[PDB]
Amino acid sequence: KKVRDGESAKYFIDEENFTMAELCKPNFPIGQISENFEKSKMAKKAKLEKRRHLRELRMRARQEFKPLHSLTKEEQEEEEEKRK
DNA sequence: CGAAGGGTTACTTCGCGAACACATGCGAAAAAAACATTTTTTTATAGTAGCCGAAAA
């Protein structure tokens, strides 16, 4: 739902939320948060896009059968982006 | 009669003090040399960076 202190110390906290049981260790949103929204949200996104970037590098490296020349082809593509 | 050898007074620039108590060798280019890294041969061992599948809705 949103960030709100539902309950604690009595049962599974449910005042304004979508939780219905205890042992919330799995995903660990439980009560509410009011600290570091966007700078901590856009960190796993950056990590995930860099991992997909390295995976598509590993996929492109199958075609050109030269590893370090594929790395120089990558930096040649990014300096084509630089001249763009 | 005129150029030259001391001889001094005159203008300018450099050395000290101001009470008497109280309680607050240094820096910077390089150069011979004693020296470690860095290996690769495993290799026992835990896990810690990073990677997809069987599980739930």
PDB file of all heavy atoms in Angstrom, chain A residues 56-57 60 71-83:
ATOM      1  N   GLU A  56      25.280  -8.989 -22.900  1.00  0.00           N
ATOM      2  CA  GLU A  56      25.210  -8.767 -24.343  1.00  0.00           C
ATOM      3  C   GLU A  56      26.602  -8.578 -24.945  1.00  0.00           C
ATOM      4  O   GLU A  56      26.804  -8.877 -26.127  1.00  0.00           O
ATOM      5  CB  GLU A  56      24.275  -7.595 -24.675  1.00  0.00           C
ATOM      6  CG  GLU A  56      24.668  -6.223 -24.157  1.00  0.00           C
ATOM      7  CD  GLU A  56      25.521  -5.445 -25.135  1.00  0.00           C
ATOM      8  OE1 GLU A  56      25.483  -5.776 -26.337  1.00  0.00           O
ATOM      9  OE2 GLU A  56      26.231  -4.512 -24.705  1.00  0.00           O
ATOM     10  N   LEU A  57      27.577  -8.131 -24.144  1.00  0.00           N
ATOM     11  CA  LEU A  57      28.979  -8.208 -24.563  1.00  0.00           C
ATOM     12  C   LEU A  57      29.440  -9.647 -24.754  1.00  0.00           C
ATOM     13  O   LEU A  57      30.124  -9.956 -25.738  1.00  0.00           O
ATOM     14  CB  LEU A  57      29.877  -7.500 -23.553  1.00  0.00           C
ATOM     15  CG  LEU A  57      30.350  -6.084 -23.858  1.00  0.00           C
ATOM     16  CD1 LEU A  57      29.213  -5.113 -24.059  1.00  0.00           C
ATOM     17  CD2 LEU A  57      31.212  -5.653 -22.682  1.00  0.00           C
ATOM     18  N   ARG A  60      27.886 -10.829 -27.969  1.00  0.00           N
ATOM     19  CA  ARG A  60      28.517 -10.276 -29.163  1.00  0.00           C
ATOM     20  C   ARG A  60      29.913 -10.854 -29.381  1.00  0.00           C
ATOM     21  O   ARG A  60      30.368 -10.961 -30.527  1.00  0.00           O
ATOM     22  CB  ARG A  60      28.567  -8.747 -29.064  1.00  0.00           C
ATOM     23  CG  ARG A  60      29.054  -8.030 -30.321  1.00  0.00           C
ATOM     24  CD  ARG A  60      29.025  -6.519 -30.168  1.00  0.00           C
ATOM     25  NE  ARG A  60      27.663  -6.009 -30.052  1.00  0.00           N
ATOM     26  CZ  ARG A  60      27.172  -5.432 -28.962  1.00  0.00           C
ATOM     27  NH1 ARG A  60      27.931  -5.290 -27.885  1.00  0.00           N
ATOM     28  NH2 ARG A  60      25.919  -4.999 -28.948  1.00  0.00           N
ATOM     29  N   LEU A  71      36.765  -5.861 -27.523  1.00  0.00           N
ATOM     30  CA  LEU A  71      36.775  -4.752 -26.568  1.00  0.00           C
ATOM     31  C   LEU A  71      37.119  -3.427 -27.249  1.00  0.00           C
ATOM     32  O   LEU A  71      36.526  -2.385 -26.933  1.00  0.00           O
ATOM     33  CB  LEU A  71      37.751  -5.041 -25.427  1.00  0.00           C
ATOM     34  CG  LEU A  71      37.238  -5.730 -24.153  1.00  0.00           C
ATOM     35  CD1 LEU A  71      36.233  -4.834 -23.438  1.00  0.00           C
ATOM     36  CD2 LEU A  71      36.639  -7.108 -24.409  1.00  0.00           C
ATOM     37  N   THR A  72      38.063  -3.446 -28.195  1.00  0.00           N
ATOM     38  CA  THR A  72      38.359  -2.229 -28.945  1.00  0.00           C
ATOM     39  C   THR A  72      37.230  -1.875 -29.907  1.00  0.00           C
ATOM     40  O   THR A  72      37.029  -0.698 -30.210  1.00  0.00           O
ATOM     41  CB  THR A  72      39.678  -2.345 -29.709  1.00  0.00           C
ATOM     42  OG1 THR A  72      39.592  -3.401 -30.672  1.00  0.00           O
ATOM     43  CG2 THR A  72      40.840  -2.599 -28.755  1.00  0.00           C
ATOM     44  N   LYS A  73      36.468  -2.867 -30.372  1.00  0.00           N
ATOM     45  CA  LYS A  73      35.269  -2.584 -31.154  1.00  0.00           C
ATOM     46  C   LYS A  73      34.194  -1.939 -30.286  1.00  0.00           C
ATOM     47  O   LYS A  73      33.458  -1.058 -30.746  1.00  0.00           O
ATOM     48  CB  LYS A  73      34.757  -3.873 -31.796  1.00  0.00           C
ATOM     49  CG  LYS A  73      33.539  -3.707 -32.689  1.00  0.00           C
ATOM     50  CD  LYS A  73      33.885  -2.952 -33.962  1.00  0.00           C
ATOM     51  CE  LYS A  73      32.691  -2.872 -34.900  1.00  0.00           C
ATOM     52  NZ  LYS A  73      33.001  -2.076 -36.118  1.00  0.00           N
ATOM     53  N   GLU A  74      34.112  -2.351 -29.018  1.00  0.00           N
ATOM     54  CA  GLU A  74      33.186  -1.728 -28.076  1.00  0.00           C
ATOM     55  C   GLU A  74      33.565  -0.276 -27.804  1.00  0.00           C
ATOM     56  O   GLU A  74      32.704   0.615 -27.792  1.00  0.00           O
ATOM     57  CB  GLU A  74      33.163  -2.518 -26.771  1.00  0.00           C
ATOM     58  CG  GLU A  74      32.157  -2.000 -25.763  1.00  0.00           C
ATOM     59  CD  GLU A  74      32.252  -2.727 -24.445  1.00  0.00           C
ATOM     60  OE1 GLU A  74      33.169  -3.562 -24.302  1.00  0.00           O
ATOM     61  OE2 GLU A  74      31.413  -2.471 -23.556  1.00  0.00           O
ATOM     62  N   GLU A  75      34.858  -0.014 -27.580  1.00  0.00           N
ATOM     63  CA  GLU A  75      35.264   1.372 -27.364  1.00  0.00           C
ATOM     64  C   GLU A  75      35.217   2.185 -28.657  1.00  0.00           C
ATOM     65  O   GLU A  75      35.029   3.404 -28.601  1.00  0.00           O
ATOM     66  CB  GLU A  75      36.653   1.461 -26.720  1.00  0.00           C
ATOM     67  CG  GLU A  75      37.823   1.147 -27.622  1.00  0.00           C
ATOM     68  CD  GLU A  75      39.153   1.189 -26.897  1.00  0.00           C
ATOM     69  OE1 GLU A  75      39.159   1.444 -25.674  1.00  0.00           O
ATOM     70  OE2 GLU A  75      40.192   0.966 -27.551  1.00  0.00           O
ATOM     71  N   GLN A  76      35.311   1.529 -29.817  1.00  0.00           N
ATOM     72  CA  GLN A  76      35.099   2.220 -31.084  1.00  0.00           C
ATOM     73  C   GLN A  76      33.633   2.600 -31.257  1.00  0.00           C
ATOM     74  O   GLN A  76      33.324   3.681 -31.769  1.00  0.00           O
ATOM     75  CB  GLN A  76      35.587   1.339 -32.236  1.00  0.00           C
ATOM     76  CG  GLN A  76      35.681   2.023 -33.593  1.00  0.00           C
ATOM     77  CD  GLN A  76      34.413   1.897 -34.415  1.00  0.00           C
ATOM     78  OE1 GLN A  76      33.659   0.933 -34.274  1.00  0.00           O
ATOM     79  NE2 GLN A  76      34.176   2.869 -35.287  1.00  0.00           N
ATOM     80  N   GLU A  77      32.719   1.737 -30.805  1.00  0.00           N
ATOM     81  CA  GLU A  77      31.298   2.072 -30.835  1.00  0.00           C
ATOM     82  C   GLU A  77      30.975   3.205 -29.867  1.00  0.00           C
ATOM     83  O   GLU A  77      30.190   4.108 -30.194  1.00  0.00           O
ATOM     84  CB  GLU A  77      30.459   0.834 -30.515  1.00  0.00           C
ATOM     85  CG  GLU A  77      28.955   1.054 -30.607  1.00  0.00           C
ATOM     86  CD  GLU A  77      28.161  -0.211 -30.345  1.00  0.00           C
ATOM     87  OE1 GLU A  77      28.783  -1.260 -30.073  1.00  0.00           O
ATOM     88  OE2 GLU A  77      26.915  -0.158 -30.414  1.00  0.00           O
ATOM     89  N   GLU A  78      31.591   3.203 -28.681  1.00  0.00           N
ATOM     90  CA  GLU A  78      31.309   4.297 -27.759  1.00  0.00           C
ATOM     91  C   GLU A  78      31.988   5.598 -28.181  1.00  0.00           C
ATOM     92  O   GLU A  78      31.473   6.672 -27.866  1.00  0.00           O
ATOM     93  CB  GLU A  78      31.694   3.943 -26.317  1.00  0.00           C
ATOM     94  CG  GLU A  78      33.168   4.012 -25.986  1.00  0.00           C
ATOM     95  CD  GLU A  78      33.476   3.571 -24.570  1.00  0.00           C
ATOM     96  OE1 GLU A  78      32.536   3.183 -23.844  1.00  0.00           O
ATOM     97  OE2 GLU A  78      34.664   3.611 -24.182  1.00  0.00           O
ATOM     98  N   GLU A  79      33.086   5.551 -28.942  1.00  0.00           N
ATOM     99  CA  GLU A  79      33.605   6.810 -29.464  1.00  0.00           C
ATOM    100  C   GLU A  79      32.882   7.249 -30.734  1.00  0.00           C
ATOM    101  O   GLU A  79      32.917   8.438 -31.067  1.00  0.00           O
ATOM    102  CB  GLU A  79      35.119   6.736 -29.690  1.00  0.00           C
ATOM    103  CG  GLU A  79      35.578   5.865 -30.827  1.00  0.00           C
ATOM    104  CD  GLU A  79      37.090   5.752 -30.886  1.00  0.00           C
ATOM    105  OE1 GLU A  79      37.766   6.331 -30.010  1.00  0.00           O
ATOM    106  OE2 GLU A  79      37.602   5.084 -31.808  1.00  0.00           O
ATOM    107  N   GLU A  80      32.196   6.334 -31.429  1.00  0.00           N
ATOM    108  CA  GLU A  80      31.194   6.758 -32.406  1.00  0.00           C
ATOM    109  C   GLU A  80      30.035   7.471 -31.720  1.00  0.00           C
ATOM    110  O   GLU A  80      29.498   8.456 -32.244  1.00  0.00           O
ATOM    111  CB  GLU A  80      30.678   5.563 -33.207  1.00  0.00           C
ATOM    112  CG  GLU A  80      31.646   5.017 -34.236  1.00  0.00           C
ATOM    113  CD  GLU A  80      31.097   3.798 -34.946  1.00  0.00           C
ATOM    114  OE1 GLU A  80      30.024   3.305 -34.538  1.00  0.00           O
ATOM    115  OE2 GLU A  80      31.737   3.331 -35.911  1.00  0.00           O
ATOM    116  N   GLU A  81      29.642   6.990 -30.538  1.00  0.00           N
ATOM    117  CA  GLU A  81      28.677   7.730 -29.728  1.00  0.00           C
ATOM    118  C   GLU A  81      29.243   9.078 -29.282  1.00  0.00           C
ATOM    119  O   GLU A  81      28.508  10.070 -29.219  1.00  0.00           O
ATOM    120  CB  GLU A  81      28.253   6.891 -28.519  1.00  0.00           C
ATOM    121  CG  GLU A  81      27.167   7.521 -27.656  1.00  0.00           C
ATOM    122  CD  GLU A  81      26.749   6.633 -26.499  1.00  0.00           C
ATOM    123  OE1 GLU A  81      27.315   5.528 -26.359  1.00  0.00           O
ATOM    124  OE2 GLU A  81      25.855   7.040 -25.728  1.00  0.00           O
ATOM    125  N   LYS A  82      30.551   9.140 -29.016  1.00  0.00           N
ATOM    126  CA  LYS A  82      31.185  10.402 -28.636  1.00  0.00           C
ATOM    127  C   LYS A  82      31.218  11.397 -29.795  1.00  0.00           C
ATOM    128  O   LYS A  82      31.004  12.595 -29.589  1.00  0.00           O
ATOM    129  CB  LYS A  82      32.600  10.152 -28.111  1.00  0.00           C
ATOM    130  CG  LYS A  82      32.655   9.505 -26.736  1.00  0.00           C
ATOM    131  CD  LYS A  82      34.085   9.196 -26.318  1.00  0.00           C
ATOM    132  CE  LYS A  82      34.852  10.463 -25.981  1.00  0.00           C
ATOM    133  NZ  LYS A  82      34.333  11.109 -24.744  1.00  0.00           N
ATOM    134  N   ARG A  83      31.478  10.935 -31.021  1.00  0.00           N
ATOM    135  CA  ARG A  83      31.445  11.868 -32.147  1.00  0.00           C
ATOM    136  C   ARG A  83      30.008  12.227 -32.527  1.00  0.00           C
ATOM    137  O   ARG A  83      29.762  13.318 -33.061  1.00  0.00           O
ATOM    138  CB  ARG A  83      32.222  11.314 -33.348  1.00  0.00           C
ATOM    139  CG  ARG A  83      31.638  10.089 -34.014  1.00  0.00           C
ATOM    140  CD  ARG A  83      32.516   9.582 -35.147  1.00  0.00           C
ATOM    141  NE  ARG A  83      32.551  10.508 -36.276  1.00  0.00           N
ATOM    142  CZ  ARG A  83      33.428  10.438 -37.272  1.00  0.00           C
ATOM    143  NH1 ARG A  83      34.346   9.482 -37.283  1.00  0.00           N
ATOM    144  NH2 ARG A  83      33.388  11.323 -38.259  1.00  0.00           N
TER     145      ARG A  83
END
